[PDB]
Amino acid sequence: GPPSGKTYMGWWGHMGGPKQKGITSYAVSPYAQKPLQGIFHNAVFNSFRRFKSQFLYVLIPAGIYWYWWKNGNEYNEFLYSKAGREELERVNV
Amino acid sequence: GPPSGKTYMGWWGHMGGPKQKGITSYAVSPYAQKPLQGIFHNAVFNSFRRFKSQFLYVLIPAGIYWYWWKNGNEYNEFLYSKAGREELERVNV
Amino acid sequence: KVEVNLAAIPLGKNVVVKWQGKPVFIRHRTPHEIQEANSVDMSALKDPQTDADRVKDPQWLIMLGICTHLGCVPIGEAGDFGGWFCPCHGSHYDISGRIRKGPAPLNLEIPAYEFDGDKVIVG
Amino acid sequence: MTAAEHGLHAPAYAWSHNGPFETFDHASIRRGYQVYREVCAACHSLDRVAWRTLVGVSHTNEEVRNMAEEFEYDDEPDEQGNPKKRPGKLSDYIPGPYPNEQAARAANQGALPPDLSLIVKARHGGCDYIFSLLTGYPDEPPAGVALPPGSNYNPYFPGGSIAMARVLFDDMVEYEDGTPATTSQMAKDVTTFLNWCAEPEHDERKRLGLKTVIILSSLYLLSIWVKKFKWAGIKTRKFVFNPPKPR
Amino acid sequence: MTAAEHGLHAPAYAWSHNGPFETFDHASIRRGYQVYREVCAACHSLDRVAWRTLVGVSHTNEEVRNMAEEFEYDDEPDEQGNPKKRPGKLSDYIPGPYPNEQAARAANQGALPPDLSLIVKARHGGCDYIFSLLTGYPDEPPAGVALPPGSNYNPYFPGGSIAMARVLFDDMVEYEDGTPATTSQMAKDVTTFLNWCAEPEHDERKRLGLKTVIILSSLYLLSIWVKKFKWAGIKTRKFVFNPPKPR
Amino acid sequence: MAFRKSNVYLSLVNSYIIDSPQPSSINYWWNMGSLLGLCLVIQIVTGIFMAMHYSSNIELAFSSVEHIMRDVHNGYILRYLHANGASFFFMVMFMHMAKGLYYGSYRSPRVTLWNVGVIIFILTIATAFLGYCCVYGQMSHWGATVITNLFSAIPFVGNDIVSWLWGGFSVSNPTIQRFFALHYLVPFIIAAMVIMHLMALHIHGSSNPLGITGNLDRIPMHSYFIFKDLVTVFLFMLILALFVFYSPNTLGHPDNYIPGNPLVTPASIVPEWYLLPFYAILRSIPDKLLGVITMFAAILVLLVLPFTDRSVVRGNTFKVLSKFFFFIFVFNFVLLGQIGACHVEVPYVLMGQIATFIYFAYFLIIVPVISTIENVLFYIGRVNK
Ligand code: HEC
Ligand code: HEC
Numbered sequence A, B: 001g002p003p004s005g006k007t008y009m010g011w012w013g014h015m016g017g018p019k020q021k022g023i024t025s026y027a028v029s030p031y032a033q034k035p036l037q038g039i040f041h042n043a044v045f046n047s048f049r050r051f052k053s054q055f056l057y058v059l060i061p062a063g064i065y066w067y068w069w070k071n072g073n074e075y076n077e078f079l080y081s082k083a084g085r086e087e088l089e090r091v092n093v
Numbered sequence C: 001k002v003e004v005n006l007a008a009i010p011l012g013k014n015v016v017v018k019w020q021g022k023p024v025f026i027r028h029r030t031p032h033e034i035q036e037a038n039s040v041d042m043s044a045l046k047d048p049q050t051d052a053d054r055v056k057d058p059q060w061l062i063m064l065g066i067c068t069h070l071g072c073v074p075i076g077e078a079g080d081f082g083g084w085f086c087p088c089h090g091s092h093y094d095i096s097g098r099i100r101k102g103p104a105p106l107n108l109e110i111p112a113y114e115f116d117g118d119k120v121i122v123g
Numbered sequence D, E: 001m002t003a004a005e006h007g008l009h010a011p012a013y014a015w016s017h018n019g020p021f022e023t024f025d026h027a028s029i030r031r032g033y034q035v036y037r038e039v040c041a042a043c044h045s046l047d048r049v050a051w052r053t054l055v056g057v058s059h060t061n062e063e064v065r066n067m068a069e070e071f072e073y074d075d076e077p078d079e080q081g082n083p084k085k086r087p088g089k090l091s092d093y094i095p096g097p098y099p100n101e102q103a104a105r106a107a108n109q110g111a112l113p114p115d116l117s118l119i120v121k122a123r124h125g126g127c128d129y130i131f132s133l134l135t136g137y138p139d140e141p142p143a144g145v146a147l148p149p150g151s152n153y154n155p156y157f158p159g160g161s162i163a164m165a166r167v168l169f170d171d172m173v174e175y176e177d178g179t180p181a182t183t184s185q186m187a188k189d190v191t192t193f194l195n196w197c198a199e200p201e202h203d204e205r206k207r208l209g210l211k212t213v214i215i216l217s218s219l220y221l222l223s224i225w226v227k228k229f230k231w232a233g234i235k236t237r238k239f240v241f242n243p244p245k246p247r
Numbered sequence F: 001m002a003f004r005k006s007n008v009y010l011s012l013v014n015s016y017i018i019d020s021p022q023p024s025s026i027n028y029w030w031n032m033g034s035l036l037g038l039c040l041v042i043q044i045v046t047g048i049f050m051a052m053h054y055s056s057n058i059e060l061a062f063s064s065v066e067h068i069m070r071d072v073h074n075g076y077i078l079r080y081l082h083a084n085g086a087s088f089f090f091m092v093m094f095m096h097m098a099k100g101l102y103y104g105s106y107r108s109p110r111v112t113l114w115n116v117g118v119i120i121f122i123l124t125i126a127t128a129f130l131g132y133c134c135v136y137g138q139m140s141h142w143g144a145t146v147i148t149n150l151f152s153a154i155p156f157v158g159n160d161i162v163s164w165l166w167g168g169f170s171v172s173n174p175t176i177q178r179f180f181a182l183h184y185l186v187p188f189i190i191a192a193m194v195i196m197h198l199m200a201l202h203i204h205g206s207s208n209p210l211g212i213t214g215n216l217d218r219i220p221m222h223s224y225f226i227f228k229d230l231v232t233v234f235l236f237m238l239i240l241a242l243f244v245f246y247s248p249n250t251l252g253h254p255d256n257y258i259p260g261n262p263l264v265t266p267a268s269i270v271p272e273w274y275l276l277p278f279y280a281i282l283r284s285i286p287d288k289l290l291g292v293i294t295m296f297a298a299i300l301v302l303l304v305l306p307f308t309d310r311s312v313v314r315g316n317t318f319k320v321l322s323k324f325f326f327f328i329f330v331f332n333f334v335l336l337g338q339i340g341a342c343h344v345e346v347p348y349v350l351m352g353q354i355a356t357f358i359y360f361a362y363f364l365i366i367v368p369v370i371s372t373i374e375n376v377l378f379y380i381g382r383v384n385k
């Protein structure tokens, strides 16, 4: 086939990153390692670190929308009660 | 992408034939030509040349198989008739 | 398994059932044509076979009226000894389903029929 | 198998719809409906032909409305849940003569009359077979046969013995256009009608086939020209070989 | 909308089949079949439940054979074509009281009793709704409702007005195991029988679910270990960087 | 570069149909593949628009087909187009295979292409058998019973695999609903296998009728072979419109207008015309297990062809004995197809046995011996010693 257009990812040998010099990487065989090392420390301290960093972003909009939903639900329950018909007619028409 | 195995057909520029030298080819624009040129001559003479070269290969096996089918069909229509019942009763029983 | 019973069908004319998609003889059975199914040629015609191991009820008769050759149908009670002309190739069976004719290789198949007493029901 | 087991082959009669530009004779279909209703409707069914398909082919709208209202179909049950009946309308289908298959086999000596709404496509020979079967009954079977009782000889039926006796006799129907209604004329008319019942698309199919065959033949020849015009430059290509100098 | 037209919500009863390892109490299914046959079968139908599904669940083989043979189904017609009846077999479905919708609406003042073979899956509330509906008929409709004639008050029904009167009263069915048949006892048994009729796969579904959840949680934890094993070399990989000398 | 090369999808379209370098020498037999593509699109589209009206129960199948014929607008066009287009698909597929084993296209660069072709052929045979079984006529039902009761010859698990095929105990409502779901399904497997057929073709390119290399002059597929394929497309549509509009029930059997009846055998059970040669192969062997083994061997013998062709030049363009015995094979196939439509009477069983033996002796005996003889004749006709 013909060659296609220029991409941003080559293959093994010509990926297309910059030239690399002076970076040395070391690694050990997994057969010589301990998997599940540090699971009981990461399960309590790392989990708390990640939760402390990323919970206001998730739980402030969740609190806003859940309070909005509960308030609208309470108003809909009030409007179709015996105590709140006399607002329901002047509310809908 | 990865490179795949050596094939026997490349693309426009590296087809993989031999080196060509000393072959010149000439061709005229079809807008300056006559299509349907020589169709009444080729229709009777070229078609007769093609038929004459390529008809024994087609019409000797066709003749053998058509004669076989005709003879077997005649034998069946003979054996399932009144005149040929004795040979039917000895050819199956 | 469908189960078809006795007392509503009298002595001496046919039933041909359709069970599991296939049609089969039953008859209430005749006195010396049961005992003409003791008169049988053993092997100067096609099969040496079995009226006891073919039908175990002495007085009633299902078996698989798929014709012998490759699967056609017979008539009821007009034929050989008072019986069953299959016109599929011109051949003939009655009160235990035996060949006296034609190109047919073997007799007919009998399914596992069992009883309300010895009241004939098929499975 | 023998010729008797095959049946005699029907000859090639000259139907008015044989041929690629032809059309059913619609007066033949109207007369054939009359012969069906007056003779064939006693034993055979027409289970696939609605009443509304006859309007504008063989009869007028009111002419079909009255023939449908002379029958009685199952209505929706009334407000107490009891079953009800109804005069027919154009939506309904042409009713058979029997309520089930066992009534049919009881009434016609064990044999079941086939439903005629696809019978010229269901039989090898088609219109020639139906015509030649209806008019093929000899006055006596050939000397030597043993016909079973309750059965009749017809050599175009495979095997010879058919359970339908000869039903068509001279002037048993009177046509409303004064045609001499003999055996051959009535068989011609029912076979044209049964062919319409099998193929009610026949006229439109042949007309559309004229349109497609003309358009596609023109497109085929025109595409031959455009192929030759495109490939002109390759069919008229010339190669010259001067052998290169040794180096 | 108003809680009246919503209907009051059924509370959470402690059913003996609520829970992921629980099974239908089959004695209560047998008693609930008795309650259906003696009370509910006058108006409602059960046409999705064959007779053979009851064998080995609530009754033996002989009992379902007798309970099927005490009914009449349509047979295939005789050799003369006349319609014929047949005593029921195991292959047949449980017949309903009315032959159509119109007989049902006639016999129940316009309303149609729903088929009960899927009714605990077809109502939001499940068995609790059915139990609360059967036992939730007050002696008087509360102060101020405009109850139409022929309609009864049940607050669990959406709107309040149900066209089914109170049909469960004490000791109207004698049980053959001597259980005291109160209103709540009969409502419990018939609701368990209706839940079996809706979900006859319930016990095998929960057993296969136990096998499947055990095998899949085994495989999930074991795959966590195999992923951490295969990825240990990439997780524990170290990079050092000495900046190269300029050239 | 051009946008037709610098895309993801248009790169594939360009590489396969626009800038594909074809050998300039290829004749009109190299249009059967694009013809089979057109046929496959015809079958899929007309089948979808008929499945919008088909009901698949055993009591509604036949009458739903006639509801398509009589009540659906232009539904006779759809049904006749689907049936005759299936038969035309098989005639064109037989021409594709006969071209392939005439011109030596099965040979050593293209053996995986030949094998993907054989898989496609098996799948189309299965698709058409299921689709003929969906209409539930009289030949449809009894064809289903004899072909499924073939599988009861396996001496251990045969009865249980035939009861698993049937969904019960003979061909009835589960069998017909199964055959509809599968007759939908197997065409999309065929479309996937056609994409794999094109992928296996594209690595080495197509052959040519000379059998010499075609690497020397080549032509892009657009504007030359697009129009040379358009010629045969319009011819094929013309001949199909003839058979659809003027002669529609010609290739079919009349007994598929009788509704399916499990109690009446139609006295000559034959399949559609294209399965007649394999039916005659199956019928020739006086055993059922060896019969189905020999029928599957008769279609799996196309795989021994790249290993029994013992000659150094590709194709029969320049050989006389290969041409002669090739056309003996082709008219043996036609006689086998005509034997498969006849009864088991006295000259026909011997004719079918001898024609089956010639069919198998072509691949296993005739092609090696004729290849070796033509090799040494090509040698000693032109070398001197
Ligand atoms: C009364 C009973 C009738 C009448 C008035 C007609 N038919 Fe015919 N028919 C009848 C039976 C019992 C049978 C079955 C015979 C058998 O052995 O199958 C038939 C058969 C046909 C056939 C099919 C023949 C075949 O299968 O090859 C056709 C077609 C047919 N009948 C048509 C027909 C027509 C057109 C009539 C017009 C007046 C007609 N029948 C009358 C019973 C009876
Ligand atoms: C006689 C008439 C009866 C008897 C003996 C029973 N039912 Fe009931 N039923 C009946 C009618 C006419 C209606 C329709 C009322 C309406 O307007 O919907 C019903 C309704 C039900 C429902 C549906 C409730 C709902 O729609 O939410 C269920 C569930 C139901 N019936 C069950 C039931 C049971 C378990 C009985 C046991 C003895 C029973 N019915 C008796 C008519 C009648």
Ligand code: HEM
Pocket: F040, F043, F044, F046, F047, F048, F049, F050, F051, F054, F065, F068, F079, F082, F083, F086, F087, F089, F124, F127, F128, F129, F131, F132, F133, F134, F135, F183, F184, F186, F187, F190, F252
């Ligand atoms: C691989 C391509 C296909 C082939 C070879 C094929 C073949 C057939 C054949 C031979 C028949 C019987 C025609 C007859 O005698 O009436 C048939 C019927 C049928 N096919 Fe297909 N078919 C194909 C694709 C499809 C697809 C994809 C569908 C579904 C979307 C489909 C739907 C049908 C239907 C509904 C019938 C019903 C009977 C009829 O209407 O004719 N077909 N098919």
Ligand code: HEM
Pocket: F029, F030, F031, F032, F033, F034, F036, F037, F040, F093, F096, F097, F100, F103, F105, F106, F110, F113, F114, F116, F117, F118, F120, F121, F190, F194, F197, F201, F205, F206, F207, F208, F302
């Ligand atoms: C759905 C069916 C099929 C389709 C769409 C298909 C498609 C194609 C196409 C488009 C080509 C290229 C054009 C050509 O050479 O004619 C081709 C080539 C080929 N096909 Fe098929 N094919 C199909 C079935 C088969 C079958 C059944 C076989 C044989 C077992 C087969 C074997 C081949 C071979 C050998 C070639 C290469 C021929 C050559 O160029 O020399 N194909 N196919």
Ligand code: FES
Pocket: C067, C068, C069, C070, C071, C072, C073, C086, C087, C088, C089, C090, C091, C102, C104
């Ligand atoms: S089937 Fe009865 S003889 Fe062949």
